[PDB]
Amino acid sequence: SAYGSVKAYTNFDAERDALNIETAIKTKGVDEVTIVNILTNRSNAQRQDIAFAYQRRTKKELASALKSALSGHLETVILGLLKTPAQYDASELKASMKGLGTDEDSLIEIICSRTNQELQEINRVYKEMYKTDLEKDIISDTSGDFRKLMVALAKGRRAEDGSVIDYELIDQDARDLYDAGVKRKGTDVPKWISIMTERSVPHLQKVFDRYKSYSPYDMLESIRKEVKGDLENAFLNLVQCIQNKPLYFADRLYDSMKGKGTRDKVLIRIMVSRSEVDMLKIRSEFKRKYGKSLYYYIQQDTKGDYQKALLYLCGGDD
Ligand SMILES: [Ca+2]
Ligand SMILES: [Ca+2]
Numbered sequence: 001s002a003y004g005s006v007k008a009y010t011n012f013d014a015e016r017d018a019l020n021i022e023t024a025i026k027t028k029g030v031d032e033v034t035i036v037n038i039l040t041n042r043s044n045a046q047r048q049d050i051a052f053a054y055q056r057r058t059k060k061e062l063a064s065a066l067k068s069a070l071s072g073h074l075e076t077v078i079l080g081l082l083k084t085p086a087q088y089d090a091s092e093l094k095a096s097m098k099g100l101g102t103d104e105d106s107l108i109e110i111i112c113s114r115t116n117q118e119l120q121e122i123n124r125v126y127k128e129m130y131k132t133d134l135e136k137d138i139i140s141d142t143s144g145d146f147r148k149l150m151v152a153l154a155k156g157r158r159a160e161d162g163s164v165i166d167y168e169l170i171d172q173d174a175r176d177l178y179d180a181g182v183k184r185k186g187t188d189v190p191k192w193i194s195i196m197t198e199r200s201v202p203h204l205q206k207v208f209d210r211y212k213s214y215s216p217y218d219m220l221e222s223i224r225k226e227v228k229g230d231l232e233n234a235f236l237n238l239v240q241c242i243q244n245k246p247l248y249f250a251d252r253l254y255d256s257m258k259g260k261g262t263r264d265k266v267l268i269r270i271m272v273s274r275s276e277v278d279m280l281k282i283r284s285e286f287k288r289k290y291g292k293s294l295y296y297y298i299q300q301d302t303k304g305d306y307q308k309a310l311l312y313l314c315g316g317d318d
Contacts, residue, residue, distance in 0.1 A: 005279035005315030008043040017042065018054035021062070025069045032074060032305040035066070039081055040312035044276060047082055073264050073306040077313075080272040086121035089114065090129055092269055093122070097141045104146075104230050106265070107138075109252065111153050112238045113245060119156025145189045146230035152197045153238070161200045170203060174210040177222075182215050187226045196238060204242045246281035247289070249274055253282070254290060257301040267298075271313040279315065293318045 017038055024031035024038075039047055054062040063082050070078055080088055089110055096106035114122060126134040138150050173195050180188035196204065208219040215222060223235045240248040253270055256263035274282060286294040295317040298310045 001277055003278045003280045004276035005283070006040070006043060006275040006313060009041060009046055012042070012046055012049075014046070014049040014053045017046075017050045018057065018062075021050065021054060022058055022065075025065055030069050032070065033308065035070070035078065036074070036305055036309045036312065039078060040309055044081070044084060048084065051082065073268065073302070074304070074309055076264070076268050077272065077306065077309045080268065081275075081313075084125075085118065085273065085276075086125040087129070088273055089118070089122050090126040090134075092273075093126065093134065094130060094137070097137050100141075102141045104142075104233060106269070107142075107150065108230075108234050108237045109266070109269075111138075111150055112234065113241045113248070114156070116156045116158050116160070119154060123154070123156065142230070144231065145193070145227075146234055148190070149193050149197070149231065149234050149238075152193055157198075159198060159200045159203070161202050165206070166203065167206075169199075170206045170210055173199065173203075173207045174214055177207070177211055177219070178214040181226045182217060182222050189227070189231070192235070196235070196242075201242050208239065208243060244285070246278050247285040249278070249282045250286040250289065250294070253286065253294060254297070257297045262301045264302075267301075267310070271298075271310050275313045275315075279313070283314065283316070283318065287318050 021035060021038055024034035038050070042050060051062045054060075054065075058065065063079055066078055066082070067075065083091065092106060093110055096103040096110070123134050126132075126137075130137070134154055135151055138154055139147060142150050176191055177195055180191035195207070199207065211222075212218050217225065219239050220236060223232060223239065226232075227235065237248070240251070249270055252266060256266040256270070270282075271279075283294050286297075290297075295311060295314050298314060299307065302310055
């Protein structure tokens, strides 16, 4: 993707990077800025190479030494940046299901936003890591139609974005979602789940637009009237991700910062997991909607080497 904010380092020397990181870790009080300076400016692939080189000579896992050396929010950023995308998501997903007190917000964010390709690797990696399938763990922590929705999405088997646009199916899908929701008493949720999980994203974009032709309310408002709870939250997030994924993340970023304090879990995860996907488009949507940059809000809400790390993931003012 040409829309990430963290690009590969041109002058990449994987051994110099490991050596310098060890020097920085060992020194008194820890040289965080150097640790940050390197990793936030190396691609994930490049951090894998820094990782391999570093273990080849310290006897230690880079992640372990860093988990030791660093603390607080900055620890969370750095250890998340070290994992591959597939591994980072698998572990956030596992933490969302943690205990009985489920973090529906995080589960929803990831499952709703990840592509077929990403979920192929996410499902794979989750098994090797936790010795259970992702689907099994989702079934265990969620129920009702919320579970059905979450499970179907996690299979990552959306139709691929075809060559031919199927306008007949776009129109029928729009009526079907009308007929299953605002037209009828209550809701036919499995029609919603089927349509919204199986069709290509470019297709559903056109469906939700054509849906405005049949329904007094757009899809987002229709969801709000038809359902509630996790199910409603899931659908709302999903329709946002389909319509404008970058805006979706921009809005979640705004939300994590707009009020008192910071929702650091959401902020850190968005900045880490989207840095090499669409952070540029996220930054662009953010600035357009909110009049000020992402960079600026991060700066107001966070401090220290934590703040510097995040700003580097952001990659520019505006
Ligand atoms: Ca209804
Ligand atoms: Ca704030």
